[PDB]
Symmetry: C5
Subunit: 310 residues, 5 copies
């Protein structure tokens, strides 16, 4: 039984994030638990305050016509408990639920450890014989408690795009709203646990540039290579198959080369050193011990720049 | 209370993918959230527009007879919220739900990293005392929003096989429709993260062909073999027990042989070199350093061709 | 309100597997999604066809008395949606649900990778003031679609034991039926991924029988031992704590010995070789390089036979 | 509407384990699926058999007053389906449900692999204006089918403590009953898979007592130490953080010492052997090769005894 | 139908922990199963005891107006079964449920293995046309059975902050209460299983200070480094990405340096020893064998102090 408007019936939305959690880089999802608020004039519900009880009367959901606001990017439909309904005397309705949904917003792992993401919540509304246009009421959209959590992320700002996108879908226009959650990743921990440990094994690798024992230079350079894979693999886990190159995975891969030529050298500073031409061998090893650190720190400036600097 | 047709009652289906996600190579499943649309003539619902309200009247699901459209390849029954119902005056009904199901379609890992998959959704309908034939209405089957996601997959095309398959099941014919989602894998990331890292460890392996120290050639060749397992295992995880040979697992296994004979050689270039016959030993190592890269790059053309080229 | 039979009321069961999945060797469970079909004469429901509507009338579940068929080996009670009810005129009822349960059937890992399992589904029915006997109707028990999946398993045959087991439980006899699903494991993949890789590391281990450097024979034999654990552990994961010896775990353990004595020898071919008695040492190593492969291939025939051949 | 007793209303309980599974050493829980049976005299329900139908009349749960029997050590409230209700003519009620709960009973990992556990199920009942006392009816407490499973455990005996513990909680006495499940662990598999593999690596370790090459005695003793961690870690996984010392973790830790002094020796038999005093060095190594095996087998008798023998 | 108070209606809360479990350091959550108790005067419910039945009358939840007490830090809404309701004659209502919620409270891993945590439960209540103020009744808040478990934690004390925090949220004041659970970690097991095993591998590392073979000093020091990662990684698992430095992760990282300079030395005591200046080399190694243990034990006092001592 929809409210006989005179034109498109505006319905006034607003989300108040209460809990925010389980951001899942792999699945590109996150859990949210907030308030949903809705308002609309249903002139029928109008009531002489004086002749009746008080300012507003409260109804159960069955009694009133209430507009189906579905979310768009959700796994299942959301779990919502209706907190209150409050018809004003002119026929203005105050609806408030407290939903708990798992949201499917995508992420840009381009700068991975140093990435900033923007999450989305959608809310379509499908029209009928009155058109339904959604729109935001920013007094119930300051939705964000001062304790929203979201581990391993700094939460920058929850806001909403005031202009709805009015699609037409299978012959009844829908109205879609864009609620936005902006987040910076907490990259700190990736340093002591990934970046540094990773760099160290790289350096040890190439003390083989001050050694002359092939036997202890393989035992060295090769053993270190292994550990890099333990890290390569460790990272490549908490991270989806991007069809594009992730910054961290760039440098994590640039590295493999520095282990490769490293080997090449130790191998060469050996074929030379045995081809009775140490003249050359200890010239190479002599230089290797300079070229690598440079070309690395160089390539990383190149890389680092190539990603963030662009 | 079914609509007394005069022949098989056609019911007009149509899916509009809204969200698409959690494709699970291991389980061979994916999550989907779309519109389901249905139409049929229920002459009873017919109504003088002029003597009554307007173009169409809307009903709750309980009021109208509505045909049970179950999905076939689903884990549980799907979670669906009814978006709208709209009986036309001739008795034509417009049903629209927004279901959210976890779909069980199988995949062909034959070309694994470079594989293209086709996913399915089925929709049977069980007949009664009127036969029910489903059929597609392609205006509500352009079902695919321009933001369907599906991480790690490029989405080629959502369409449907217009001719239903009319089975007879336990004495009431059912009508089944085939909705098709075609996808190409995003193979890019498998390169910097699996293929390349994997090839590198292989090459280092066989710098042992320019070494002459057994001790540093095992520490070398053996250490590299281990890492290959870290990769072998890494891959063999995000991947079901195919009863058949997966391309990537082919080359991932072809490799083990190149590690084996590698060892064989270093081992031989040692039993020879100590059987006072370096004449031979440094003839073998001499050639090993050519045969392996060739026979590999050769075998890979052979392999690569054997898979994609056929 | 049970149907006043004149003796034990037979209820006619039948399962039609539609989906079959998530077989979990660790938990000894599997997921299933099938039809449940039931029939019984409730003479009360009988109806003059001529004086009434048609062949059969359909009821909602609340209207008719319907016998509680619980499954026995289930985690929670099963999730079932009622597909149809059809009382015949003599009072014969056609019930059809589509349940989706997680089933708890045990497995025999004795021949592990080459094991064949038989899964079970039970269906008790608890009697009241008429005795209830269940029994199978094999026209609704050809339950098995031609697309049942069950990854990593070949599905041999779904059938049922026609004779119910009529227990008496806490004073009301129950009737239990045995539905059986027989499956052979798809052992193929365990070859390129476990068995072979495993054998290789074993062989490399004992090239130490053609080496004479203790230093490169430990670096060798010990390094390989490690990798075997990586495999030992890998396997010991997707596999419950059987109180009995699993074939694969037999040979996976027989192996440890061949690594042990291997060490013993290299260690001995060293205490001898340094006790100025290479006379003996290179006699041992001489034989070791024959005994091991034999005694192995021998023990494996012994083992293999001991398991499958008995 | 409770039954107006004349004193404490006795309610007669009884559990019949049907399925038993997912014992979780880490979480200290287990899943169970059994019958719950209850009896009480509700004189109101009394009925002239002769003037009425038969021996007993059956009711739905809403009709009769039925006593809330909650379980105590449960994660969530239990999932129970009511199997039957049967009021006798004196007003004696026969209630039978089939619940399925996840139970939270603790375990004594003191003798870990060789531990015997006793699990619990509780059933409080909160009184009102008649006191409610629970008590066991041992004819519905032989609850244990002859197929109860519980992988990796031998099930010794399901029984119950006949005397309830009548607490007073927040001013209404409660009555609590103790159902007991006794289980021995199936320790067999821990031998081929943990204990033995673990002892082997220990012995190999100290063939370094018959070697004289520090270089191959470290590559030896150190490589073996690593593998022990692979086992140390493997075990320390399927096992909660006991605030106390687990037998297995005792010997798994005693071991580390035998690796430590082992190293000490090889290290010493080297500082000695190079301080031109092999007089001593090969006196130490000479004895080391006796002391360790003894002091070990000695300490293990000490340990073993200390745990099981006390 | 709310109770027409004369001022803010106080509602009297109280939790009695019955079961406590699944504390999840990674997710920062825990499961709880307790009693919730509520009291309020609803003068309407008042009843002449003499003219009516007895002391108190009991109602079903539907009959009475009952205040919505939502928990705040919960994943989903909590699963609660109503145990009893008991209106006194003045209109005083005794509500008692037994809920089972998964609670989202954060933790301070600063002292990780030796950390003490405080968990929270919240209970808002949203006002209407009478203000609702919650408050604690400490006779139903001694909520904590003498068998609360919580594996791997010693439970210090369950209590509550008597003064509610009265927020105003979207125009209706809410009242929030703070229930507190204080817990000390059971750090014992982390010793035999992490700390000690970890220290051992560190010591062995630097027996390389009494060795002079570079080849056996890398095979030594490098092999031990690997094992430390097996531990580094092991730990870094059961532990969230803190944006801050965890004590255990401090010392677990301080370590890497002692492996690094260790290498440096062995590498140097080799470039020196071969630059025909053993004068120096065996002066360094001479000192290394003192400096490291000191600077370590020193840094650990520094570290240990830095964390716990501040
Ligand atoms: As190694």
């Amino acid at each position: 039984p929809p409210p006989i408007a005179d034109e498109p019936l505006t319905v006034n939305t607003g989300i108040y994030l209460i809990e925010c959690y389980s951001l899942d880089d792999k699945a590109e999802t996150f859990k949210v638990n907030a308030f949903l608020s809705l308002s609309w004039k249903d002139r029928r519900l109008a009531f002489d305050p004086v002749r009746s009880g008080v300012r507003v009367k409260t109804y159960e959901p069955e009694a009133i016509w209430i507009p189906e606001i579905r979310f768009v990017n959700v796994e299942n439909a959301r779990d919502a408990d209706v907190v209150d309904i409050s018809v004003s005397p002119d026929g203005t309705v105050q609806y408030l639920e407290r939903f708990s949904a798992r949201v499917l917003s995508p992420l840009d792992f381009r700068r991975y450890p140093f990435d900033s993401q923007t999450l989305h919540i959608y809310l379509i509304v499908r029209s009928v014989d009155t058109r339904n246009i959604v729109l935001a009421v920013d007094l119930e959209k300051v939705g964000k408690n001062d304790d929203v959590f979201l581990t391993g992320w700094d939460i920058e700002s929850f806001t909403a795009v005031v202009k709805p996108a009015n699609f037409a879908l299978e012959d009844r226009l829908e109205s879609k709203l864009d609620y936005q959650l902006r987040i910076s990743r907490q990259y700190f921990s990736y340093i002591p646990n990934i970046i540094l440990p990773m760099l160290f094994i790289l350096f040890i690798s190439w003390t083989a540039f001050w050694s002359t024992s092939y036997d202890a230079n393989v035992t060295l350079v090769v053993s270190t290579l292994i550990a890099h894979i333990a890290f390569n693999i460790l990272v490549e886990t908490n991270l989806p198959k991007t069809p594009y190159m992730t910054y961290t995975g760039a440098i994590i891969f640039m590295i493999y080369l520095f282990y490769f030529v490293a080997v090449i050298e130790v191998t060469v500073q050996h074929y030379l050193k045995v081809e009775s031409q140490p003249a050359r061998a200890a010239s190479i090893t002599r230089a290797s011990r300079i070229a690598f650190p440079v070309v690395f720190l160089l390539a990383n400036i190149i890389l680092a720049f190539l990603f963030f600097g662009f």
